[PDB]
């Protein structure tokens, strides 16, 4: 039936020549490489839109410009809803969609052509996950699996600490935003895995958010969300 695997791809895997054998999932922030060389004239990928909004596909390429991409939404494999425009040696386009599975079908018109491409998709939205109690110590931290996840948590009553972990795979600035659903005293601290006492940064209140940006190098990190007054619910986004 419809593949439900959650492991993203970074590279195509033939055969992927129509919607029924599409490679995927492609996720935001992870580049996929492939090529349409010789008689390989079509490649198909799928991706999941997690929140309604505007989705952008950018496909930088080298080789012939004689090809394009079409997008289809699950449920209608005949009528494509968007196609790419050539701009500066890439095929780009933005289209509005609603949540659900979509397919990008890249195909060339002349089978003498050699084309290689990389594919970037943006604007897919965040998946919402719940924290997993008990997460009151770093060894029981709830894993944040990628940088397109909103974690939903609460600190009601006895529960005063929620530890989360995330991995940074390449150096860059990370944005940590806790959104307070209720008015209470909550904050967060960030720690390296190797030194749970070394405090790297601390969240700063700005209106209803407690946030900070920090440049981190590759590695695993612990994020402790803890309350110092009242009780309430929050959502937690770690963004790149």
* Site of interaction with Ca ion (CB under 5 A): 16-17, 34, 40, 43, 135-136, 153, 159, 162
* Residue 76 assigned to a binding site: no
* Residue 18 assigned to a binding site: no
- Spatial contact of 169 and 218, defined as CB atoms under 8 Å apart: yes
* Residue 235 assigned to a binding site: no
Contacts 24+ apart (CB under 8 A), 111-114: 111/38, 111/39, 111/41, 113/36, 113/63, 113/64, 113/66, 113/67, 114/35, 114/36, 114/37, 114/38, 114/63, 114/64
Q: What's phi and psi for 139, nearest 5 deg? A: -80, -10
- Spatial contact of 57 and 37, defined as CB atoms under 8 Å apart: no
- State in angstroms the smallest separation of the CB of 217 from Ca ion: 28
* Residue 133 assigned to a binding site: yes
- State in angstroms the smallest separation of the CB of 131 from Ca ion: 5
- State in angstroms the smallest separation of the CB of 171 from Ca ion: 30
DSSP 200: -
- State in angstroms the smallest separation of the CB of 52 from Ca ion: 29
- The burial class, CB within 10 Å (0-12 / 13-18 / 19+), for 124 is buried
Calpha distance 197→41 (Å, rounded): 55
* Residue 183 assigned to a binding site: no
The total number of residues shown for the chain amounts to 240
- State in angstroms the smallest separation of the CB of 158 from Ca ion: 9
CB nearer to Ca ion: pick between 142 and 148: 142
CB nearer to Ca ion: pick between 135 and 148: 135
* Residue 42 assigned to a binding site: yes
Calpha distance 130→214 (Å, rounded): 24
CB nearer to Ca ion: pick between 49 and 59: 59
Residue ranges for the binding site for Ca(2+)?
Answer: 12, 14, 16, 35, 40, 42-43, 131, 133, 135-136, 154, 159, 161-162
Residue ranges for the binding site?
Answer: 12, 14, 16, 35, 40, 42-43, 131, 133, 135-136, 154, 159, 161-162
């Amino acid at each position: 039936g419809i593949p439900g695997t959650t492991t993203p791809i970074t590279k195509e895997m033939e055969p992927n020549d129509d919607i029924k054998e599409a490679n995927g999932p492609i996720v935001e922030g992870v580049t996929v490489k492939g090529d349409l060389n010789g008689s390989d004239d079509a490649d198909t990928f799928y991706f999941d839109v997690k929140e309604d909004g505007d989705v952008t596909i950018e496909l930088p390429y080298s080789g012939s410009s004689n090809f394009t991409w079409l997008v289809y939404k699950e449920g209608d494999d005949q009528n494509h809803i968007a196609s790419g425009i050539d701009k500066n040696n890439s095929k780009v386009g933005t289209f509005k969609s609603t949540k659900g599975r979509h397919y990008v079908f890249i195909y060339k018109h002349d089978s003498a052509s050699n084309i290689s491409y990389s594919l970037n998709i943006k604007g897919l939205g965040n998946e919402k996950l719940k924290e997993k109690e008990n997460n009151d110590s770093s060894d029981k931290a709830t894993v944040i699996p990628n940088f397109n996840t909103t974690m939903q948590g609460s600190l009601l009553g006895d529960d005063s600490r929620d530890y989360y972990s995330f991995e940074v795979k390449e150096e860059g600035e990370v944005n940590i935003e806790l959104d307070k659903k209720d008015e209470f005293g909550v904050t967060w601290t960030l720690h390296p895995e190797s030194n749970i006492n070394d405090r790297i940064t601390y969240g700063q209140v700005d209106g209803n958010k407690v946030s900070n940006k920090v440049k981190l190098r590759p590695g695993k990190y612990y994020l402790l969300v803890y309350k110092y007054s009242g009780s309430g619910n929050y959502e937690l986004r770690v963004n790149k």
